[PDB]
Amino acid sequence: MVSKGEELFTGVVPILVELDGDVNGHKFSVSGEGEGDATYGKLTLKFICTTGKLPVPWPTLVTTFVQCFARYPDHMRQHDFFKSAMPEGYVQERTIFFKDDGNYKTRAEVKFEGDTLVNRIELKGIDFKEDGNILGHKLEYNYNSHNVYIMADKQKNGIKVNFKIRHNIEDGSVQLADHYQQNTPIGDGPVLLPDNHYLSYQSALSKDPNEKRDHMVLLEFVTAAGIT
Ligand SMILES: [F-]
């Protein structure tokens, strides 16, 4: 039996992302558009800073910029919380600690509007060093593969997620960003609370050679695993 949630993701789905950001008082907005193809775990998105120059490095926003698009193997379908919350959606909250620097806190509401999967995000960043790796833009425009570890948070009717990102600094060192995440359904309906597993991510960051606004093209593949 295919759930209503699953059924919404069987083909290519347009995506709209809207973010309002304030990091150490530097305010900015970003919009993104693209499409997701959950059958293949494939995300293709282009983001544009609509307020001018982005005040932080684009790579620090990659994790913020729709896990309902992950490819869950058939044998793990009972563990896909993200799709089971659709179309009413879910709220994703994170705190991202940059080691030896500031922190982002984010709140993202992810839901369908008609045929478009929409994500509305607010990001607040505080305690950054104005000449640290983030505000001083010292991070390379590239990205590593990682695993993201998901567990049920039964008491919250949602999930708890942890993981670490290691951003390459331009001197060959690394800027650790420790992510703590939780997701909770927006609706009151039943959702799938998963056994422990993980999502395997691969990301490639690129530029649109015809685009003059500050922007990032993101191509990401996401696959659930760890339960066999
Ligand atoms: F999420």
From Swiss-Prot:
<dbReference type="InterPro" id="IPR009017">
    <property type="entry name" value="GFP"/>
</dbReference>
<keyword id="KW-0157">Chromophore</keyword>
<dbReference type="Pfam" id="PF01353">
    <property type="entry name" value="GFP"/>
</dbReference>
<dbReference type="GO" id="GO:0008218">
    <property type="term" value="P:bioluminescence"/>
</dbReference>
<keyword id="KW-0599">Photoprotein</keyword>
<dbReference type="InterPro" id="IPR011584">
    <property type="entry name" value="GFP-related"/>
</dbReference>
<keyword id="KW-0455">Luminescence</keyword>
<comment type="similarity">
    <text>Belongs to the GFP family.</text>
</comment>
<comment type="function">
    <text>Energy-transfer acceptor. Its role is to transduce the blue chemiluminescence of the protein aequorin into green fluorescent light by energy transfer. Fluoresces in vivo upon receiving energy from the Ca(2+)-activated photoprotein aequorin.</text>
</comment>
<dbReference type="InterPro" id="IPR000786">
    <property type="entry name" value="Green_fluorescent_prot"/>
</dbReference>
<dbReference type="GO" id="GO:0006091">
    <property type="term" value="P:generation of precursor metabolites and energy"/>
</dbReference>
<protein>
    <recommendedName>
        <fullName>Green fluorescent protein</fullName>
    </recommendedName>
</protein>
<comment type="subunit">
    <text>Monomer.</text>
</comment>
